[PDB]
Design a protein around this ligand. Structure first.
Ligand SMILES: CC(C)Cc1cc([N+](=O)[O-])c2[nH]c(C(=O)O)c(CCC(=O)O)c2c1
Ligand SMILES: CC(C)Cc1cc([N+](=O)[O-])c2[nH]c(C(=O)O)c(CCC(=O)O)c2c1
Ligand SMILES: CC(C)Cc1cc([N+](=O)[O-])c2[nH]c(C(=O)O)c(CCC(=O)O)c2c1
Ligand SMILES: CC(C)Cc1cc([N+](=O)[O-])c2[nH]c(C(=O)O)c(CCC(=O)O)c2c1
Ligand SMILES: O=P(O)(O)OC[C@H]1O[C@](O)(COP(=O)(O)O)[C@@H](O)[C@@H]1O
Ligand SMILES: O=P(O)(O)OC[C@H]1O[C@](O)(COP(=O)(O)O)[C@@H](O)[C@@H]1O
Ligand SMILES: O=P(O)(O)OC[C@H]1O[C@](O)(COP(=O)(O)O)[C@@H](O)[C@@H]1O
Ligand SMILES: O=P(O)(O)OC[C@H]1O[C@](O)(COP(=O)(O)O)[C@@H](O)[C@@H]1O
Lengths: 319, 320, 320, 318
């Protein structure tokens, strides 16, 4: 279409899938919560908290995502970074989908006004009986849809499916997500590497070798640039848009890494794979990992395909 | 505590100075220009480009700050990252202040929606000559006011003057800068180090030693965390808010730093120094460098006092 | 119970009806246009028309509604106030509904910032022929959905369907229409009368008695309060919220009324009747008029049922 | 050039070489009006309806009250909401008295009709300690007056000795842009505005003037009627299109309804500075010495030739 919004896109894909309408509602409701998070994160009401008339952001972000998905009547199992246990959706609001999400990723440094985001992954409930945590304990292969909302210079929702990766820009004037990049694919190889080098002491010998290769090239090529925002959303989105490699690997004081499998690693792994990129743990593909806990951690090396390959060569020489 | 706005703050400080009124109008014009830049960076109206009716961003940032400072009747000389030569203002709109600014810093990566900003530094024409580019070649210690606007997760304008550093959040619901951080001061020592380590090969020997004492500290202490947004305004603002050190040191390519002295290094150094921090080029304080060219490049190492001192002693160990 | 949005409501209503999506996609595309009208009506970006960076409102609304409805793939015949003839939709973007809309009713006095609105009514193409203006010449009982968006104090959409009348409020912080009043009903009787009494010289005796019964109540009761905004969407909505009666009757100048049947009278008559109220020409119900022209005018009297009937007993004394 | 309300008020006080108080006061009021506009337009309404799972005229009063106190520019504040004048705390007092209606018309706000904020500024002329007497000044002593209409769009209209200046809010940046400079009213217009429901209670002179507009004597066009029920909107139409607004003596209101200090006198200043007129029938609104902050007063305002035509009829019945 000429003016393709998230609302039109999500009904067309859907009609194209012969659907009942539940996922379309889930994604329009998730969309609505994304706009409300964006507003508060840009500090909309801040004057009133500072006494203009006289007289928490990740909690509000979680209450928004939760109450919108619940009201969509399309969810049964919800897994959030904020709740230690699975939300079993009250039965008069049960739909057929599992949602795992991080409502505000990077809020560790939200006081320095750094980019943050909302990460989400959506599954079809595997059961046909009673919704359980086990409906959430599915590999990334089974993802119906996954993506993130970036609150940076501007607000962007990225939605990945079998049809591909689609970037929508939020126009704050009218509250519409505007399709602005269709079927995005990654660069085969990039010139950027991304990881917290403040753990350089605790690193794996293969990770140390891959990084020196980027700073000290073996092909007399150009050394890569370094970028690490500290928000996964901003660094993964930079990796999608410009190319390169992002690493939060297993060191030694965290043998499974930091980032969570269900609502951080898997959703980005899906976006990367649909965009022609890769997402390994070192041993297997992040999407191949079988969950055993909802707040499980997994290591992750995602990004441009020839970069994740170059890492894997080193990882296996040291294995 | 009462509520305050950027506008009311700026009007009260000038009422105390019992002066012309040019600097107050200048700051109000920059204020207004930033709120406009913020709206265009947040992509208000992008639906009109994709067919809502049927019927730039770094260049538009320059056009807005240039136009708004000329309408203030407070400027005579203007220097921008975007214009090769200075802009000598029309005589009918001319005033006594020289402004140097980066209209949209970091927007060479804006496609990934990385945090970007507007950096400014205001001087007073100290000369009697006809206005020229030689009026912008004042050192940083002559700065009247400096600061930056950060278009990150939210929009904040950080204003630095002799009275201190003050941080105002942009409330988009009412279009007002709310003061939310009065007379800010930087922590004495931080736990974050900020630099592009992709240049480790061509890094001066002392930088190597300093980053290796943060990665591998022999003092049984916790190693430092690494952060580098790749946009100066976001990296500096994090260094101001959480403490730590930001470094754009000299390397093979860009051997006098890549960052610009008049509108990147000096405004950031003035904010750090007004907040009890420090900012050096290795051999000298950034503010004490006498400029030779308006687009001149300088190295920069800024942030918490103890962290910049720690680098400086490693620097004394690698020099003659 | 739970919060609801227009986008969610219109999608669930279409799912419950096991429909194709055309009405959902039309009503969603008409919503998106309404949010864009509101942003422009509230003068967002007026600063760029006055040189913030150096270098229509009823025509703009029509352009928005037209292109948004055309892009819905749910429309075949489009009748406006701005277009003398109907618009036949290009075949590749053709649907099954016929929309009659007034894209910015009240714009003639938009210089005093009077309340304005977008009135719309949606019919089914009953013809299996080629799309023509003939398809718009359907009576108002054949309406599928009718409503309006008011741009006043706040911006509110009112969407009348067979399920009833529902009022949604635009949250300009998120660009979402929040369901705030459900299955709305009009009061049985009100305390407000609304017409332009400057036409007093020209009223037929039926209007002359009724008015005097409201300023000089025979029932010993209190006199009715007078209100006339001069913008139909504002006067009709007030009559829906507070009850009472709105009148644009047959006078000399404009002898069979001024307000148009297809895109002003019929949509407000459907909202009124679905909310327990009445709308008449004096002779017949507004929804009962078979149209012959798409810009045909009609007398209109609407509002609280006791009030409309009280007039209709007065009209029936001066008939033929 | 691009001229905003903030640029305008700084330049006028720099040319008047003033302390800066008045500039801070109007700039404080400008910030409050932008906050009322956001509330009136229903920002965050989703949060009250449970988007995350979970008073306008009171909020309007609080916003102006606190923005004015914090201005360091006022000493006496009279509000339609506050039954007694507020004496500002000593450690922030200023030299100006402000009478204001924070959200005029908000009675009929369930229908989303245009509402507004009216204000007028005085200089404390007394030598005493601040008190209500500092606000019982007649409207001829006004330094500044005007209104904020929240209609189809938001406009702050500022009237001073320099003239009447109309400014439009760009809600995207939060800036009031000068869109009409040194505004004047038509000598005669073609719109009459009053509640004709109080017809049984009206004075002989009102009934006559009204019937001379609907049933004209000169065989001219009968005048058109417009009555929104909100004064800010009815008086804005009177300033832009011209004509006559009337809230006169009836019976339930022997001295009218609209209050002189924060409704009648403010709009009378705007009209006079725009070449128009504003009378009570007996005297000009600006020349009525008030004894009560919440005192009521009839007001006939609008295009000069039209208000004079009314007065000639009032003098007929005398
Ligand atoms: C790759 C795409 C073609 C998958 C897709 C996308 C959307 N979508 O863009 O919302 C969908 N919506 C719905 C619905 O229930 O209406 C379905 C069918 C349910 C299912 O089997 O998952 C669906 C499928
Ligand atoms: C340098 C700051 C610590 C003090 C400061 C702040 C503002 N202000 O925040 O608007 C000022 N405005 C104006 C003016 O009237 O032009 C002046 C007068 C120039 C001077 O004496 O330095 C002034 C001074
Ligand atoms: C008219 C109301 C009482 C019910 C209603 C409301 C909406 N809606 O709120 O958008 C609808 N949308 C669609 C659609 O086309 O999907 C339908 C089915 C139409 C049909 O069966 O012909 C539909 C029905
Ligand atoms: C009444 C107008 C035609 C002139 C006017 C307008 C503004 N203004 O537009 O804000 C002013 N501001 C200030 C100030 O205090 O700086 C003054 C001077 C103070 C005084 O009245 O003695 C002033 C004068
Ligand atoms: O500070 P670290 O240890 O480098 O971790 C950074 C990582 O943690 C995260 O911040 C996630 O944790 P939070 O969401 O609590 O901030 C990632 O966004 C980011 O990639
Ligand atoms: O890409 P590098 O070499 O790390 O340099 C980053 C620095 O260059 C800049 O991007 C220069 O700004 P521009 O993007 O506008 O050219 C700084 O903002 C930033 O601190
Ligand atoms: O001036 P009048 O005769 O009272 O007409 C008012 C009527 O004209 C209208 O303004 C017509 O709309 P327009 O302003 O777009 O022409 C109605 O909204 C309103 O009911
Ligand atoms: O309702 P009436 O009697 O016609 O009076 C309307 C007048 O009352 C007002 O609404 C003021 O009273 P409120 O502020 O309580 O609404 C004026 O705006 C308006 O001019």
């Amino acid at each position: 279409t000429d003016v393709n919004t998230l609302t039109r896109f999500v009904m067309e894909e859907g009609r194209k899938a012969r659907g009942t309408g539940e996922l379309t509602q889930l994604l329009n409701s998730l969309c609505t919560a994304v706009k409300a998070i964006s507003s508060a994160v840009r500090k909309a009401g801040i004057a009133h908290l500072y006494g203009i008339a006289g007289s928490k952001l990740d909690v509000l972000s979680n209450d928004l995502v939760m109450n919108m998905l619940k009201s969509s009547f399309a969810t049964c199992v919800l897994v959030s970074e904020e709740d230690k246990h699975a939300i079993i959706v009250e039965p008069e609001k049960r739909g057929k989908y599992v949602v795992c999400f991080d409502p505000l990723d990077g809020s560790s440094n939200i006081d320095c006004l750094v980019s943050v985001g909302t990460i989400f992954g959506i599954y079809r409930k595997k059961s046909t009986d009673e919704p359980s945590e086990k409906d959430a304990l599915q590999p990334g292969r089974n993802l119906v849809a996954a993506g993130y909302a970036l609150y940076g210079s501007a607000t962007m929702l990225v939605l990945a499916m079998d049809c591909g990766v689609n970037c929508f820009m939020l126009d704050p004037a009218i509250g519409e997500f505007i399709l602005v990049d269709k079927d995005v694919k990654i660069k085969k190889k990039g010139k950027i590497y991304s990881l917290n080098e403040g753990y350089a002491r605790d690193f794996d010998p293969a990770v140390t070798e891959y990084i020196q290769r980027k700073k000290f090239p073996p092909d007399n090529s150009a050394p890569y640039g370094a970028r690490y925002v500290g928000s996964m959303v901003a660094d993964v989105h930079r990796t999608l848009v410009y190319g390169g490699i992002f690493l939060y690997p297993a060191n030694k004081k965290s043998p499974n890494g930091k980032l969570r499998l269900l609502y951080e690693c898997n959703p980005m792994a899906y976006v990367m794979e649909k965009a022609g990129g890769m997402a390994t743990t070192g041993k297997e593909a992040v999407l191949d990992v079988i969950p055993t806990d909802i707040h499980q951690r997994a290591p992750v090396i995602l990004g441009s395909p020839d970069d994740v390959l170059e890492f894997l060569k080193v990882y296996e020489k040291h294995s």
